[PDB]
Amino acid sequence: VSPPPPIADEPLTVNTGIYLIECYSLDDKAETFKVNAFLSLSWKDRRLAFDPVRSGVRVKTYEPEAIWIPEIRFVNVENARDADVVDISVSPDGTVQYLERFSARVLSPLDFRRYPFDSQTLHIYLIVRSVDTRNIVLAVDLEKVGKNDDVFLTGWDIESFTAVVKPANFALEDRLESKLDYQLRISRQYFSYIPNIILPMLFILFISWTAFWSTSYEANVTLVVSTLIAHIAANILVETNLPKTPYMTYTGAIIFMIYLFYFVAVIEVTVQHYLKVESQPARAASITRASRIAFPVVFLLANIILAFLFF
Amino acid sequence: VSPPPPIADEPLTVNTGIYLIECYSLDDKAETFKVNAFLSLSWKDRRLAFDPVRSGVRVKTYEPEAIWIPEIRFVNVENARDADVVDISVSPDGTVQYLERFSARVLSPLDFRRYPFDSQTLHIYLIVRSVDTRNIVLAVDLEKVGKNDDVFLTGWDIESFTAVVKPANFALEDRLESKLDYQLRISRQYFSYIPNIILPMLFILFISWTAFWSTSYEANVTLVVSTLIAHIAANILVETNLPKTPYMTYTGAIIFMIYLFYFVAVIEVTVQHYLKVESQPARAASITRASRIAFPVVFLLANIILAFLFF
Amino acid sequence: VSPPPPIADEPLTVNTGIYLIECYSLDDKAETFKVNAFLSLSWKDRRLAFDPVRSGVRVKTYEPEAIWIPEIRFVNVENARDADVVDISVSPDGTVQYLERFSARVLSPLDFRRYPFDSQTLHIYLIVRSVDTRNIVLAVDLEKVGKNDDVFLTGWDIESFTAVVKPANFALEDRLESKLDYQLRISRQYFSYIPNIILPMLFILFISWTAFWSTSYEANVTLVVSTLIAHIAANILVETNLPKTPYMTYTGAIIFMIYLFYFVAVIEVTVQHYLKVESQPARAASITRASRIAFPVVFLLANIILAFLFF
Amino acid sequence: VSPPPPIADEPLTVNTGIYLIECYSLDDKAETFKVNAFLSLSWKDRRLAFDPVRSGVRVKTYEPEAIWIPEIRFVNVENARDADVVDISVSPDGTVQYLERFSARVLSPLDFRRYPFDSQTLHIYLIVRSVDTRNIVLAVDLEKVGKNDDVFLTGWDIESFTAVVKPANFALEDRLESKLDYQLRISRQYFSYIPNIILPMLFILFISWTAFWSTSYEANVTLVVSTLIAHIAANILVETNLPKTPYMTYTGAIIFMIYLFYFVAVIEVTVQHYLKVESQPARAASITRASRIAFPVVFLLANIILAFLFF
Amino acid sequence: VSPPPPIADEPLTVNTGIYLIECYSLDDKAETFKVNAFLSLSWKDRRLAFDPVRSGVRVKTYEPEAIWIPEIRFVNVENARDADVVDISVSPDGTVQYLERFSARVLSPLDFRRYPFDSQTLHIYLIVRSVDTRNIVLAVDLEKVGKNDDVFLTGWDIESFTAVVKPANFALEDRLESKLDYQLRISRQYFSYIPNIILPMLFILFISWTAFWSTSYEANVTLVVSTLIAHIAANILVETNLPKTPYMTYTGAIIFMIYLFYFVAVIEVTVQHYLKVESQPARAASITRASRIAFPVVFLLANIILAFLFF
Ligand SMILES: [Cl-]
Ligand SMILES: [Cl-]
Ligand SMILES: [Cl-]
Ligand SMILES: [Cl-]
Ligand SMILES: [Cl-]
Ligand SMILES: [Cl-]
Ligand SMILES: [Cl-]
Ligand code: NA
Ligand code: NA
Ligand code: NA
Ligand code: NA
Ligand code: NA
Ligand code: NA
């Protein structure tokens, strides 16, 4: 089989569409997501023209091996898509209507800067390479782009699924390539992070600040060191759900900052004990009373500054 | 091969049945389950009819490639089902009886609101897309819907496996689609959660309340902070077995509430120590004695309120 | 190809055998095991009979596609077995000898009631469905049932591999089905559980009982709360190696009971401190001295009761 | 195609060779390793003999389907090997030279008795089953047994890759079977275990012995119980990298023994406190001073005994 | 099909190129990475030569089965590459242009000596085995070596993708083999290691040094033992992200050294308490005051020495 011949000199236009059936396994660490969808393709092949009078039928049904089919691939997939042809319908003028159902693991980078209050634009890049006989170009049939109402991505809200209608046509290894960008816009469901990580992390921090109403050094050491260890556990828990980034994330910034608060609280508890032992408790009392106001105030202002820098 | 032609203008009715052989791997985080079952299909193909008295044969056995077979798919599967055709039988009037054994990973959302005392309705959606020649509609043969007695889903009780007999007929990408909903009703075996998570979590909380019968600040700090850390470990353990939800689960609510009890217990232990240091122990004694009643009473009433809101 | 015709009205007997080559990956949580074995099949096909003299051959070899082969399946497998035909030999009377080597992941429920001192009976269920032409029944050729001497299942002792010679014949989707039960009897190697979990768990418990020879409340709180946390770690470790069961396991029972001992030890440590503060140490001394005997005695008797109920 | 006929009554000798290209994923828990290698086969087929003078060709190249090829399998593999035929060459006398590149997951038991100072002999068992026409026997062509210089198994040193030249010929399911044993000798790189597990474990143990230079019961309880918990963490870490064995490993023995040292240290700390409270500190001083020598001395001698029993 | 015949006695030159489309899953423990790329091949086959005037075409498009294609393999892959042929084009003089898109998991050793400030050279080794008929040699077409601008390897910076133009020609099982080395140079994004592991590890160490401003033995024991346990947690966390190496890594060296600092801090805290109890506090004061300077100074100098030895 060979490509359809041009009537004049034009490129062959392959109309495309993606209809999402299932979205699952958005893996933050791997920066992948799995998709189950319909891929629709349409092109004119006049060599397949027929008379409904002679053949009896108004539409011809073909097997993929029987006719020429454009070699359409995905750019950002781990392995080639698992595809099953649903239908190949040829109309009397030779217009082919191809429909396949596929499943694929898509690699799409994620911006974790505002995590867990982040939004993402996932991409599915469709591509075709031109052949010697003819140049092939891709187009979007907007009537065949969409998603099932039941499409749910656990832990995310699906906003939209649209296609950039203009393909990116470029030269690659001395041949033309036609690339389409299908965009799935999603926003993270931050809800569960509040009772599971944010509030527990704030509770243990506020518990360490009870040391500013205690003169007992041994109890103070226990309060600040124990809550610090619990903070380390939350830091480790959070970093297991995330990849290593060459930038600070919002959560990462807060988690890092809270270490500084634990470090300065240990200094305060040490300074307080040292002065008490040196028979200077009046002074220790001034530092401890100031700390009761300074620690929550600096914590609030530092969080306002961080929220401002990130949002 | 082409679809069987209509005698009048009627859609082709494909009778379906699913008989469960195995149920395994209900993954709560992934919201998937694996299934091994029989899929039965039945439709009339008049082009295949034969005489019973002339032929001598009551039934004719065909290979899948020899005859037309409807393209039946599952909506909510990760990848296409792994299927092996078992038998194809044709009756004299041309009634085809198709049987395949398949295995599939099914995506079906779970409602964790009442976890671990939750019940679920798992779905297996059967679908067929109509052809240009004619419309294909699905039906349920209740005689061919069921499950093996030995079907066990580890950690769950299987209640029923039924089908919604009326299909959901709708247009998708300019062709009719006929969808059937097979429902597997299950209820979680909550038993093991009681000795492994619920009672250990209650024991450590009650151990923190022994601080209300102690005047030793240093021992009190050790009691409340150590048990809090053990509570954090249980919180982390529980959240590893569950996906992130945009709602509170019953267990999540109790786990979150128990933090408030630890936080107020730390305030009480701090207030008690502060007053004793300020030579006001009579008062500290009033707060500590009130706490002995208030903490278990507010804990009981808050749990009655939560159980009422969730069940 | 069609099934061999009956001389009278008899069912077709397919003689079976399973010879285990490899046993691996017994997954307790998943209740699965992987198997690599020979599957042997034997039946009479009159249509393939020959005379040895005029043929010059005592045996005839065929390709699977050339002749009729019974559709033998496994009931309790995740996916269909990976099989490769080794040999197909036909004797003069048309007796077919089929041999395949296969690998499969088998689902077989496990009884964890006596864990880690438990024994199991793993099952491999062989099945065949009848055809309209004739009833197909399974039999066991005991001469072709066995296992390689080197077959080892890591963490288990293999006792026997036998077959229940009488098949379970029953109707399924209006056709008769013939099922054979191959049983692999195994017993768990409990050895490693003694130095890794049982003795460490006993050591930390006995360490908490040193609080009955101490009047220091602060030290006592540290002894009982620290060892309790280590007990929680062992509880979590044990429950990660096991599925959730709607019953108590032997280890689960002991682990749960040990919490009660920690809870009562905290009450004792609290009561002791309370009385000392109330200037009643003579009394506290009576409770502490009684506890030194009561705790190990009640622990021994409770363990004798538990061992009796479970074994 | 059928096997080459015997000139007299001799068995068909299939000469074999395995050339390792890659070794990876030695999984201690699973007792598996992955291999990527060349498999070379050689046998005489007189039916393929030709004249080199008149043919003008020294060698003929065939496709696997064109000629008879012996069914060679691996005994100890999870699934059948993934193989790609590289070349088939026939010499004028009819000697066939077969070469394939394969990849396989091999099951090979490991002896953990001396872990992490252990050495292993990994096995790759080659097998052939005799056909009805004639008996097939395996041989080793030492000229075609080897490994690439770059073959590296992460965490191990590769010593040798040799074959036991005499096959194990035996009857299995009324046929002959010819088995070859390919041995890959490896020794574990114990280096990293010293700074990561052994020395940290010794440091925390020696830290618990500082309690023999302290009269503070509260500090002593904290020293011995905290380091014990850290020892439990190392015990858990070590047992996650290993399967459960029906014998003691060297590391397992040391880890278990160190619990006894923690248990006796708690007794000593308890006895010391008890005597001080009973106004017998002179005596407590004698036990504590003896403990300073006894604990390191008994620890050294017990380790010499253990090293002797294991090496 | 057979290889192109030599005009004189020359080896057949196969020109190669690799164009990277995707780079993902660099697994440090496994020492693997996944790649999705174009593989281009070019060679002269005179038997395929044609006259452009006579044929009426300037290029000829074949199917892989229709013509001879060199058996090109990757040396350092887990399994054979997943490949799909994109195009085969023949010029009038018989110059074949082959293009395939492939995906593979590549084995490539990593040097962890400078981790997490390390750089790596990943290798993709292309290989061809000669045939009896002629010798096959590989070459690099630099015009067909490259990478897509969007190629990103999570946690790494991609520096260059080049090929060593001179192949490594050698004998393997009496046949010539021609090997090409494609090199992907990468450098680790160490950024996230600073707020997540390095600074938290320094903070807990500096917190242990507050014991040099405290005379409270019980508080000191709590400070040094608690922070040591947190250091053990970081040691375990770090070693889970890395394979076991027969050498010290930079991070491993620092982590190991920090144990020595904890060990000597415990000795100091013990010596200080012992002297106080022995009524020698003036002396204890001299050791504690010296420790305040000695510990940070020796820590800084030891780190300068380590950084010098490693970089
Ligand atoms: Cl693709
Ligand atoms: Cl499907
Ligand atoms: Cl099967
Ligand atoms: Cl094999
Ligand atoms: Cl390859
Ligand atoms: Cl050489
Ligand atoms: Cl050569
Ligand atoms: Na085609
Ligand atoms: Na068909
Ligand atoms: Na303490
Ligand atoms: Na057949
Ligand atoms: Na063959
Ligand atoms: Na070819």
Secondary structure of chain B as H, E, C letters: CCCCCCCCCCCEEEEEEEEEEEEEEEECCCCEEEEEEEEEEEEECHHHCCCHHHHCCCCEECCCCCCCCCCEEECCECCCCEEEEEEEEECCCCEEEEEEEEEEEEECCCCCCCCCCCEEEEEEEEEEECCCCCCEEEEECHHHCEECCCCCCCCEEEEEEEEEEEEEEEEECCEEEEEEEEEEEEEECCCCHHHHHHHHHHHHHHHHHHHHHCCCHHHHHHHHHHHHHHHHHHHHHHHHCCCCCCCCCHHHHHHHHHHHHHHHHHHHHHHHHHHHHCCCHHHHHHHHHHHHHHHHHHHHHHHHHHHHHHC
3-class secondary-structure state, position E289: helix
What are C295's strand-pairing partners?
none
**What backbone torsions phi and psi does residue B166 show, to the nearest 5 degrees?**
-85, 115
Asked if A130 contacts A76 with a C-beta cutoff of 8 angstroms, the reply is no
The first and second tokens of residue C127, run together, are 């099945």
Q: Which ligand is nearest to the CA of E103?
A: 5
Whether B132 sits inside 8 A of A89 (CB atoms) is yes
Q: Closest to D24 (Cβ–Cβ): which among E107, E246, E247? A: E107
Pairs of residues, one from chain C and one from chain D, whose beta carbons lie less than 8 Å apart = 120
Q: Closest to D80 (Cβ–Cβ): which among C38, C82, C237? A: C82
Asked if B179 contacts B190 with a C-beta cutoff of 8 angstroms, the reply is no
Q: Quote the CA–CA distance of B304 and B40 in Å, as a whole number.
A: 49
Asked if C97 contacts C87 with a C-beta cutoff of 8 angstroms, the reply is yes
The first and second tokens of residue A131, run together, are 């052949």
How many angstroms separate the alpha carbon of residue A70 from the centre of ligand 13?
A: 23
Torsion over CA: D233, D234, D237, D240 (sign): negative
What is the 3 state secondary structure string of chain A?
CCCCCCCCCCCEEEEEEEEEEEEEEEECCCCEEEEEEEEEEEEECHHHCCCHHHHCCCCEECCCCCCCCCCEEECCECCCCEEEEEEEEECCCCEEEEEEEEEEEEECCCCCCCCCCCEEEEEEEEEEECCCCCCEEEEECHHHCEECCCCCCCCEEEEEEEEEEEEEEEECCCCEEEEEEEEEEEEECCCCHHHHHHHHHHHHHHHHHHHHHCCCHHHHHHHHHHHHHHHHHHHHHHHHCCCCCCCCCHHHHHHHHHHHHHHHHHHHHHHHHHHHHCCCHHHHHHHHHHHHHHHHHHHHHHHHHHHHHHC
Place of tokens 């990478």: E147
Q: Quote the CA–CA distance of E167 and E129 in Å, as a whole number.
A: 13
Instruction: Tell me if the bond preceding A116 is cis, omega within 30° of 0.
Output: yes
Q: Closest to A195 (Cβ–Cβ): which among B107, B218, B252? A: B252
Asked if B101 contacts B117 with a C-beta cutoff of 8 angstroms, the reply is no
In this structure, are strands A95-107 and A82-90 parallel, antiparallel, or unpaired? antiparallel
B33 to chain C nearest CA, in Å?
A: 12
Asked if E144 contacts E17 with a C-beta cutoff of 8 angstroms, the reply is yes
Determine how many CB atoms are found less than 10 A away from the CB of residue C260: 13
Given strand D156-171, what is the order of strands in its sheet? D72-74, D119-129, D176-188, D156-171
- Return residues with CB closer than 5 A to ligand 1 (ion): A 73-74, 80-81
Q: Quote the CA–CA distance of A251 and C217 in Å, as a whole number.
A: 40
Asked if A134 contacts A12 with a C-beta cutoff of 8 angstroms, the reply is yes
Q: Quote the CA–CA distance of A238 and E114 in Å, as a whole number.
A: 26
- CA–CA distances in Å: residue B274 to residues A215, B271, B284, B285, E128: 9, 5, 9, 12, 81
Chain E residues closer than 8 Å to D152 by CB = 109
DSSP state of C77: B
Q: Which chains touch E (3 or more CB pairs under 8 A)?
A: A, D
What is the 3 state secondary structure string of E12-43?
EEEEEEEEEEEEEEEECCCCEEEEEEEEEEEE
C115: Cα separation from own chain's centroid: 11
Chain B residues closer than 8 Å to C174 by CB = 143
E23: Cα separation from own chain's centroid: 12
- CA–CA distances in Å: residue D283 to residues B140, D210, D268, E276: 88, 19, 12, 21
Q: Quote the CA–CA distance of C88 and D132 in Å, as a whole number.
A: 10
Torsion over CA: C47, C52, C55, C59 (sign): positive
Place of tokens 């454009």: A70
Q: Is E232 exposed, middle or buried (0-12, 13-18, 19+ CB in 10 A)?
A: buried
The first and second tokens of residue D253, run together, are 């023995």
Q: Closest to A226 (Cβ–Cβ): which among B229, B256, B263? A: B229
Q: Closest to E244 (Cβ–Cβ): which among D143, D189, D203? A: D189
Q: Is A95 exposed, middle or buried (0-12, 13-18, 19+ CB in 10 A)?
A: middle
In the chain, the amino acid numbered B154 is T
Instruction: Tell me if the bond preceding D200 is cis, omega within 30° of 0.
Output: no
CA-wise closest residue to D229 among C259, B225, A240, C225: C225
With a CB cutoff of 8 Å and minimum separation 6, the contacts of E222 are: A218, A221, A222, A225, D222
CA-wise closest residue to D21 among D107, D131, D103: D103
| Residues across chain B | 311
How many angstroms separate the alpha carbon of residue E70 from the centre of ligand 13?
A: 7
Q: Is D305 exposed, middle or buried (0-12, 13-18, 19+ CB in 10 A)?
A: exposed
Torsion over CA: A56, A57, A63, A68 (sign): positive
CA-wise closest residue to C36 among B113, D77, A161: D77
Asked if B222 contacts B207 with a C-beta cutoff of 8 angstroms, the reply is no
Q: Is C98 exposed, middle or buried (0-12, 13-18, 19+ CB in 10 A)?
A: buried
Q: Is B171 exposed, middle or buried (0-12, 13-18, 19+ CB in 10 A)?
A: exposed
In this structure, are strands B95-107 and B32-44 parallel, antiparallel, or unpaired? antiparallel
Q: Quote the CA–CA distance of C212 and D215 in Å, as a whole number.
A: 19
For domain D193-311, the CATH class is mainly alpha
Q: Closest to B21 (Cβ–Cβ): which among C75, C232, C266? A: C75
In the chain, the amino acid numbered A63 is E
Q: Quote the CA–CA distance of D256 and C269 in Å, as a whole number.
A: 30
- Vertex D39 angle, CA C86 and C82, to 5°: 35
In the chain, the amino acid numbered E240 is T
Question: HSE (CB half, 13 Å, CA atoms) of B265?
Answer: 32
Q: Is D83 exposed, middle or buried (0-12, 13-18, 19+ CB in 10 A)?
A: middle
Q: Closest to C200 (Cβ–Cβ): which among D78, D109, D232? A: D232
Mutation target for A interface from B266, B274, B280: give the one with most A CBs within 10 A.
B266
Place of tokens 């252990």: D118
The domain locations on chain B are: 1-192, 193-311
Q: Quote the CA–CA distance of C249 and C306 in Å, as a whole number.
A: 11
B273 to chain A nearest CA, in Å?
A: 8
CA-wise closest residue to B99 among B133, B141, B47: B141
In the chain, the amino acid numbered E112 is F
3-class secondary-structure state, position C235: helix
CA-wise closest residue to C230 among D235, D238, D260, E225: D235
Whether C61 sits inside 8 A of D131 (CB atoms) is yes
Asked if B256 contacts A195 with a C-beta cutoff of 8 angstroms, the reply is yes
A178 to chain E nearest CA, in Å?
A: 14
Q: Quote the CA–CA distance of D205 and D199 in Å, as a whole number.
A: 10
Please check whether the two domains, C1-192 and C193-311, share a CATH topology.
no
Asked if E23 contacts E151 with a C-beta cutoff of 8 angstroms, the reply is yes
Asked if E83 contacts E102 with a C-beta cutoff of 8 angstroms, the reply is yes
Q: Name the closest residue on chain A to residue B269, using Cα atoms.
A: A210
B218 to chain A nearest CA, in Å?
A: 5
**What backbone torsions phi and psi does residue D251 show, to the nearest 5 degrees?**
-65, -40
Final resolution, Å: 2.8
Q: Quote the CA–CA distance of E121 and E182 in Å, as a whole number.
A: 10
- CA–CA distances in Å: residue B95 to residues A200, B68, B90, B130: 65, 12, 6, 20
Rg over alpha carbons for chain C, rounded to the nearest Å, is 31
Whether E173 sits inside 8 A of D99 (CB atoms) is yes
Q: Which ligand is nearest to the CA of D3?
A: 12
Chain C residues closer than 8 Å to D77 by CB = 22, 36
Mutation target for A interface from E59, E63, E81, E214: give the one with most A CBs within 10 A.
E214
Asked if E68 contacts E2 with a C-beta cutoff of 8 angstroms, the reply is yes
CA-wise closest residue to A218 among E218, C306, D240: E218
Q: Quote the CA–CA distance of B102 and B82 in Å, as a whole number.
A: 5
Whether A200 sits inside 8 A of B132 (CB atoms) is no
Whether C222 sits inside 8 A of D217 (CB atoms) is no
Q: Quote the CA–CA distance of E268 and E213 in Å, as a whole number.
A: 12
- Vertex D41 angle, CA D40 and D45, to 5°: 150
Determine how many CB atoms are found less than 10 A away from the CB of residue B117: 15
Q: Closest to D19 (Cβ–Cβ): which among E133, E173, E270? A: E173
Chain A residues closer than 8 Å to B78 by CB = 22, 24, 34, 36, 103
Q: Quote the CA–CA distance of C61 and E136 in Å, as a whole number.
A: 41
Place of tokens 């529980």: B238
Q: Which ligand is nearest to the CA of E79?
A: 5
Whether D129 sits inside 8 A of C86 (CB atoms) is yes
Chain D residues closer than 8 Å to E270 by CB = 210, 213-214
What are C24's strand-pairing partners?
C34
Torsion over CA: E286, E287, E289, E293 (sign): positive
Asked if D105 contacts D81 with a C-beta cutoff of 8 angstroms, the reply is no
**What backbone torsions phi and psi does residue A138 show, to the nearest 5 degrees?**
-100, 150
C122-147: buried (b, 16+ CB within 10 Å) or exposed (e) per residue?
Answer: bbbbbbbbbbebbbbbbbbeeebbbb
Q: Quote the CA–CA distance of C178 and C16 in Å, as a whole number.
A: 12
D62: Cα separation from own chain's centroid: 39
CA-wise closest residue to D288 among A40, A230, A30, E277: E277
DSSP state of E252: H
Q: Quote the CA–CA distance of D295 and D280 in Å, as a whole number.
A: 22
E250-265: buried (b, 16+ CB within 10 Å) or exposed (e) per residue?
Answer: bbbbbbbebbebbbeb
- CA–CA distances in Å: residue C229 to residues A14, C208, D146, D263: 65, 11, 54, 17
Q: Quote the CA–CA distance of B311 and B292 in Å, as a whole number.
A: 29
Q: Which ligand is nearest to the CA of E71?
A: 13
- CA–CA distances in Å: residue E203 to residues A249, E174, E231: 21, 62, 10
3-class secondary-structure state, position E259: helix
CATH code of domain A1-192: 2.70.170.10
C162 to chain B nearest CA, in Å?
A: 21
Q: Quote the CA–CA distance of A48 and A46 in Å, as a whole number.
A: 5
**What backbone torsions phi and psi does residue A256 show, to the nearest 5 degrees?**
-65, -45
What are A96's strand-pairing partners?
A43, A90
Q: Quote the CA–CA distance of B152 and B162 in Å, as a whole number.
A: 17
Asked if E136 contacts E213 with a C-beta cutoff of 8 angstroms, the reply is no
CA-wise closest residue to B245 among D309, A46, C111, A192: A192
Question: HSE (CB half, 13 Å, CA atoms) of D86?
Answer: 24
Whether D203 sits inside 8 A of E77 (CB atoms) is no
Q: Report the structure determination method.
A: X-ray
CA-wise closest residue to D232 among D210, D250, D256, D253: D256
Asked if D211 contacts D261 with a C-beta cutoff of 8 angstroms, the reply is no
Whether E233 sits inside 8 A of A235 (CB atoms) is no
End-to-end, the C-alpha distance of chain A in Å comes to 56
CA-wise closest residue to C156 among C115, C195, C197: C115
How many angstroms separate the alpha carbon of residue B91 from the centre of ligand 9?
A: 18
How many angstroms separate the alpha carbon of residue C54 from the centre of ligand 12?
A: 28
Chain E residues closer than 8 Å to A80 by CB = 82, 84, 101, 103
Q: Tell me the Ramachandran region of residue D11: left when phi exceeds 0, alpha when psi lies from -120 to 50, beta otherwise.
A: beta
Q: Which helix (H) or strand (E) holds C296?
A: helix C281-310
In the chain, the amino acid numbered D38 is F
Q: Quote the CA–CA distance of C218 and D219 in Å, as a whole number.
A: 10
What is the 3 state secondary structure string of chain D?
CCCCCCCCCCCEEEEEEEEEEEEEEEECCCCEEEEEEEEEEEEECHHHCCCHHHHCCCCEECCCCCCCCCCEEECCECCCCEEEEEEEEECCCCEEEEEEEEEEEEECCCCCCCCCCCEEEEEEEEEEECCCCCCEEEEECHHHCEECCCCCCCCEEEEEEEEEEEEEEEECCCCEEEEEEEEEEEEECCCCHHHHHHHHHHHHHHHHHHHHHCCCHHHHHHHHHHHHHHHHHHHHHHHHCCCCCCCCCHHHHHHHHHHHHHHHHHHHHHHHHHHHHCCCHHHHHHHHHHHHHHHHHHHHHHHHHHHHHHC
How many angstroms separate the alpha carbon of residue B70 from the centre of ligand 9?
A: 8
CA B188, B191, B196, B202: dihedral to nearest 10 degrees?
100
Pairs of residues, one from chain B and one from chain C, whose beta carbons lie less than 8 Å apart = 122
Chain E residues closer than 8 Å to D218 by CB = 218
Q: Which helix (H) or strand (E) holds C120?
A: strand C119-129
Biggest alpha carbon–alpha carbon distance for chain E: 112
- Return residues with CB closer than 5 A to ligand 9 (ion): B 69
DSSP state of C192: T
CA-wise closest residue to C138 among C10, C16, C37: C16
Asked if C79 contacts B82 with a C-beta cutoff of 8 angstroms, the reply is yes
- Vertex A257 angle, CA A253 and A260, to 5°: 155
